[PDB]
Structure 1
Amino acid sequence: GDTKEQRILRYVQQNAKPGDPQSVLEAIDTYCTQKEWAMNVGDAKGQIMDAVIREYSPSLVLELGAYCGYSAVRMARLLQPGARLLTMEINPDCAAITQQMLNFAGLQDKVTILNGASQDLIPQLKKKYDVDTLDMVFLDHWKDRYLPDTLLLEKCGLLRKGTVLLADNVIVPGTPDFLAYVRGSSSFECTHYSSYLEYMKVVDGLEKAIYQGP
């Protein structure tokens, strides 16, 4: 009766070392490679995300799209003490898996799961979650939302000079509108990171777009 996501969690629960985030990541990677593909950011693009977290050391990170919690584990494990991750997930079943995955890895104290559509939650961040500004945003939910969620973040005043946006899948499935925006706009300084689609040999990439403000 397991969903694909419950199958991933079941595999982690019996194979990974409890309280060990790295072991959790390794187990998910193993499942997706050997048994059944899933849309985790994956290890190859994961290395790029790790480098970004390490370089900028964000105290408040926002993730759009949690799924099974793979990327939340990846990022949370690298956050400095005192730092926090907020992750938005529209699907309550995925939000449940993500919560269990974080609990297993022992990272539940660094992460808060917000349930609902990013378009609905973003305007609530300041009032309802005491957010000042964000240090980093990881966009990895659905391609049609990348551009409007970015403008929504700006409109709500959640980005500041230096805020790092990191977008997954800007090549496959591809996000031409978002790319047109960050690359064409003086409000952003951009870097493309070429890599591979999770657990595949197909080329994909991340885009890092750093907000310069007005």
Structure 2
Amino acid sequence: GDTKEQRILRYVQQNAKPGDPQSVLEAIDTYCTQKEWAMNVGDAKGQIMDAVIREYSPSLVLELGAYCGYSAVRMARLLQPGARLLTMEMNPDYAAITQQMLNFAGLQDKVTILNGASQDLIPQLKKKYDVDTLDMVFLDHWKDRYLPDTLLLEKCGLLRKGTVLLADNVIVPGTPDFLAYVRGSSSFECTHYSSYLEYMKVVDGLEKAIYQGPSSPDK
């Protein structure tokens, strides 16, 4: 039958207002709430996301996991003219829906969808995509890759002192190894934010982890 993703885009195109990103977010959330797709209702995690973008005003953001473009629209609507969101999405069908979503919101010029797995694309950012360091990273992809991809970003020289990581779903279904690493490491200053999931009626959360630069090369 019809995929979730084709129906989400349909609903936006039929109900939201072109070039009004807020209306796009609200349409996605309305539809996904009515369908009882708990993990696809973004308004609770979005309050935390908006505050992070407003405080730090990043010029270059990397998103891991686009899906249908909700979080890309959410962040990009608050970015400055000339600022950039790179979003990595390994499923080309989802990349396609995200592209259509951005076009409808009028935010396509601020976002570049990179089609592939984060583990493959991250090592290409410096040379292929001319990235220096990221100002912010939003982690919202495969749970078991949050810690590995953080370590990969570190190794590839893509984080600087001040880079803000914001990780979603760190409680449900959970990213406990990622949390233990950043909270335990002197290279990250961390803050936790609670975020509710309907239907399951559970308090999930997001973690903000601000990179402080690498640990000493010596003991």
Aligned-residue offset at 1:26 = 0.4
Aligned-residue offset at 1:3 = 1.2
SS at structure 1 position matched to 2:85 = strand
Q: 2:151 aligns to what?
A: 151
TM-score by length of 2: 0.94
Aligned-residue offset at 1:194 = 1.1
Aligned-residue offset at 1:197 = 2.5
CA distance in 2, matches of 1:154, 1:197: 31
SS at structure 1 position matched to 2:151 = helix
For 1:50-105, what per-residue CA distance to the aligned partner results, in whole angstroms no more than 9, with x for missing partners?
Answer: 00000000000000000000000000000011100000001000000000000000
Q: Judge conservation of contact 2:135–2:164 (CA < 8 Å) in 1.
A: yes
199-208 vs 143-152, greater mean Cα deviation: 199-208
Aligned-residue offset at 1:41 = 6.0
SS at structure 2 position matched to 1:109 = helix
CA distance in 2, matches of 1:41, 1:193: 17
Q: Judge conservation of contact 2:63–2:88 (CA < 8 Å) in 1.
A: yes
For 1:105-136, what per-residue CA distance to the aligned partner results, in whole angstroms no more than 9, with x for missing partners?
Answer: 00000000000000000000011111010000
Q: Judge conservation of contact 2:38–2:200 (CA < 8 Å) in 1.
A: no
Aligned-residue offset at 1:199 = 7.0
Q: 1:46 aligns to what?
A: 46
- Gaps in structure 2 of 5+ consecutive residues: 214-219
- Gaps in structure 1 of 5+ consecutive residues: none
Residues 198, 99 of structure 1: CA spacing in aligned structure 2 closer, same or farther, 3 A cutoff? farther
TM-score by length of 1: 0.97
CA distance in 1, matches of 2:70, 2:123: 26
Aligned-residue offset at 1:159 = 0.1
Q: Judge conservation of contact 2:29–2:41 (CA < 8 Å) in 1.
A: no
Q: Judge conservation of contact 1:42–1:199 (CA < 8 Å) in 2.
A: no
Q: Judge conservation of contact 1:29–1:43 (CA < 8 Å) in 2.
A: yes
183-192 vs 31-40, greater mean Cα deviation: 31-40
CA distance in 2, matches of 1:178, 1:32: 28
Residues 44, 137 of structure 1: CA spacing in aligned structure 2 closer, same or farther, 3 A cutoff? same
Moved segments of 4+, more than 6 Å? none
Q: 2:216 aligns to what?
A: none
CA distance in 2, matches of 1:9, 1:58: 28
Q: Judge conservation of contact 1:166–1:206 (CA < 8 Å) in 2.
A: yes
Aligned-residue offset at 1:39 = 3.1
> In the alignment, is residue 112 of structure 1 matched against residue 112 of structure 2?
yes
